[PDB]
Amino acid sequence: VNFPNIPAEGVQFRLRARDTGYVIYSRTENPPLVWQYNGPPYDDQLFTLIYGTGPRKNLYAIKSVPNGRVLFSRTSASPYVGNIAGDGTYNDNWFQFIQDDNDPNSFRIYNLASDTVLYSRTTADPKFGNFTGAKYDDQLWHFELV
Amino acid sequence: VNFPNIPAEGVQFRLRARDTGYVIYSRTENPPLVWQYNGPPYDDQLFTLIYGTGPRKNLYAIKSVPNGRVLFSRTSASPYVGNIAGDGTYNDNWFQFIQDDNDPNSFRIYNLASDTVLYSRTTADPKFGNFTGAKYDDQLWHFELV
Numbered sequence A, B: 001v002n003f004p005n006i007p008a009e010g011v012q013f014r015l016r017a018r019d020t021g022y023v024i025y026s027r028t029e030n031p032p033l034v035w036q037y038n039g040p041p042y043d044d045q046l047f048t049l050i051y052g053t054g055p056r057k058n059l060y061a062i063k064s065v066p067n068g069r070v071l072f073s074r075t076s077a078s079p080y081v082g083n084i085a086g087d088g089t090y091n092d093n094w095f096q097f098i099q100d101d102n103d104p105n106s107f108r109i110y111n112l113a114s115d116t117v118l119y120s121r122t123t124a125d126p127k128f129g130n131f132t133g134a135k136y137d138d139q140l141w142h143f144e145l146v
């Protein structure tokens, strides 16, 4: 089931992991350009959604407020999770927000092109990334409206 | 996770529900045109896949062998599950095959446009249809190779 509380188009938010409490950032300098962060609020943690239509209905591009780049999640080349300019020019720029089967208040950030979800953990490196496999709690996210 | 054993493009198969053992049929006359059936093998139970590309990567159109129509699954209008001429003109003609979380050999027939899965049951009417909500075993299918 699609997450029932997806922010309206253009509404700004942070993406915060339910369990770690870390947020995603998307920047243009100093790789990794997309990663998780535990610290003060920076503008590169702010996102809006571009609503997919037609073949992209129920998918969304995740766009950076300060730099305008959208996220991608792929398995073909490094970096696997990154950003790129535009408004979702490429297939792997498009994400589905899938409500958790148990916790109705959180969702997975799912990529149709790559069949992956984003995760945030405190355990094994890489501590942030994408993943194809079983459901784990470290794949659960919140929209944090600002 | 996408079902790892999706038939090659153009290969013929039946869609049989794991629990009821009923198969889907798709015909042009006598409604319901798409429904479940408990009985002998007939041509209107035979399907092939059109492989989606580009924005439809990891999605598939399900085409009927004897009549050439593709399936649809929608919540907008009755019939909710049906067929239509073409090769996938509409977004509700496009399906993802999502492996079950527990049973690696079965999958849900998921529609991105409508956020529904197909089900087959012996209990309440309608005994075949689509559904937006929790995971139930009556939503599990096999590709039956012919």
Ligand SMILES: CC(=O)N[C@@H]1[C@@H](O)[C@@H](O)[C@@H](CO)O[C@H]1O
Pocket (backbone or CB within 6 Å): A025, A027, A037, A041, A042, A043, A044, A045
């Ligand atoms: C002083 C400095 O570089 N701090 C960076 C900041 O620029 C921002 O990218 C943040 C993630 O929101 O990560 C921090 O490590």
Ligand SMILES: CC(=O)N[C@@H]1[C@@H](O)[C@@H](O)[C@@H](CO)O[C@H]1O
Pocket (backbone or CB within 6 Å): A119, A121, A124, A131, A136, A138, A139
């Ligand atoms: C053994 C191990 O590292 N397991 C992790 C699992 O805990 C979870 O983090 C998942 C990503 O959601 O990735 C797996 O590789």
Ligand SMILES: CC(=O)N[C@@H]1[C@@H](O)[C@@H](O)[C@@H](CO)O[C@H]1O
Pocket (backbone or CB within 6 Å): B071, B072, B074, B084, B090, B092, B093
């Ligand atoms: C005008 C209208 O309703 N168009 C629908 C279309 O949206 C789609 O549901 C299709 C089945 O793939 O059936 C059509 O009748």
Ligand SMILES: CC(=O)N[C@@H]1[C@@H](O)[C@@H](O)[C@@H](CO)O[C@H]1O
Pocket (backbone or CB within 6 Å): B119, B121, B124, B131, B136, B138, B139
């Ligand atoms: C309350 C109720 O009847 N729930 C059913 C559920 O058991 C299952 O059959 C599902 C289809 O997967 O449809 C639901 O309407």
